[PDB]
Amino acid sequence: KVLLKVIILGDSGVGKTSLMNQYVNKKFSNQYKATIGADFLTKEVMVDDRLVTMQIWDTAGQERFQSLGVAFYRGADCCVLVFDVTAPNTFKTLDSWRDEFLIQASPRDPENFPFVVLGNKIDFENRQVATKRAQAWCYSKNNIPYFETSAKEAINVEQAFQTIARNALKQETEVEL
Ligand SMILES: Nc1nc2c(ncn2[C@@H]2O[C@H](COP(=O)(O)OP(=O)(O)NP(=O)(O)O)[C@@H](O)[C@H]2O)c(=O)[nH]1
Ligand SMILES: [Mg+2]
Numbered sequence: 001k002v003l004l005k006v007i008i009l010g011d012s013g014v015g016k017t018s019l020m021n022q023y024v025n026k027k028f029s030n031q032y033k034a035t036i037g038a039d040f041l042t043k044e045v046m047v048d049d050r051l052v053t054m055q056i057w058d059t060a061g062q063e064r065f066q067s068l069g070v071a072f073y074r075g076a077d078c079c080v081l082v083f084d085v086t087a088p089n090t091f092k093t094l095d096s097w098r099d100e101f102l103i104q105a106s107p108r109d110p111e112n113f114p115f116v117v118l119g120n121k122i123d124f125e126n127r128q129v130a131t132k133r134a135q136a137w138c139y140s141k142n143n144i145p146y147f148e149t150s151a152k153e154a155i156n157v158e159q160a161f162q163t164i165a166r167n168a169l170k171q172e173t174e175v176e177l
Contacts, residue, residue, distance in 0.1 A: 004054045004168040005075045009097040010082035011090040012061030015120040018151035019082065020058050023161050028152050035060040038072055047165045054165060073104040078114040078168035083134075085119045085127040085148065091134060098141070109174070114167035115144040118160060123150035 008016045017035050021027050024041045040057045057072065079101050083090040094117065102110050117138050119129065131148060138146040145167070147160040 002050065002052050002169065002172065004052055004077045004165070004172055005057065006054055006078045006080060006164060006168055007057045007073060007076045007101070008059060008080040008082060009101055010061060011084070011087075011093050013087070014061065014082040014084040014090050015151050016061065016082045017058050019118065019120060019149065019157060020056055022151040022154055022157050024056065026154075028154075034062065034065070036065045037067070038070065043161075045161075045165050047162070047169055050169070052165055052169060054161075054168065071104065073101060074106075076101075076105045076107070077172045078116065078164055079105075080164055081115055081117045082120055083117070083129070085121050085129050086124055088128050091129045091137075094137065095141075107171075108177075111142055112171075112174075114171050115141070116160065116164050116167065117144060117146045119146065119148040121150060121152075122148045122155065123153045 008020065010016055018028060020041055024043045035058055038057055038059045040055050043054045043056065045052050045054055081094050081097055083094060098115060107113050119134055135146055138144045145163050147156045149156040149160055151157060
């Protein structure tokens with residue numbers, strides 16, 4: 001019985017909120033309800049012989065909803081990085097999201113911290129960002145795992161979150177100290 005904090009970072013419009021309500025509640029909606037502030041949802045899951053409670057913190061990509069020195073980050077056990085395959089700008093921002101996270105949570109051993117990158121929205125056909133340069137990018141950065149997901153049609157949502165889970169748990173375990 002173990003608690004995992006998991007934070008979902010990335011630009012506004014990538015579908016951070018939609019991946020959440022899909023994974024947790026198996027529901028999808030077209031209605032873009034801009035995420036004000038930062039809340040969470042819990043999903044209970046089984047990872048490797050162990051019941052895990054995953055607290056999933058969904059944040060506001062916009063700077064329209066920033067207050068104001070967000071230290072909700074720390075105690076994080078896995079940071080999830082979401083870009084939109086139809087928008088090259090949301091992929092370019094990933095380092096900046098990754099840097100910002102590491103400043104804020106500043107976990108010890110920062111470069112073994114579990115990141116997961118989700119190429120959301122592959123249910124569309126106008127993908128701009130190939131699988132190949134995002135596969136590269138996740139590899140350039142300590143070989144972090146990468147899925148191409150769709151919250152709408154629910155492709156790789158479950159699979160990806162099994163990895164989010166398992167990696168969150170390894171990291172939690174690493175607090176032997
Ligand atoms: N076709 C399709 N639309 C998606 C997908 N994921 C999200 N959307 C749509 O994209 C828009 C933005 O989604 P949203 O979840 O709000 O993204 P967000 O990153 O959480 N935005 P915010 O940071 O402002 O909450 C919404 O219209 C949403 O329904 C997807 O996989 N496929
Ligand atoms: Mg959101």
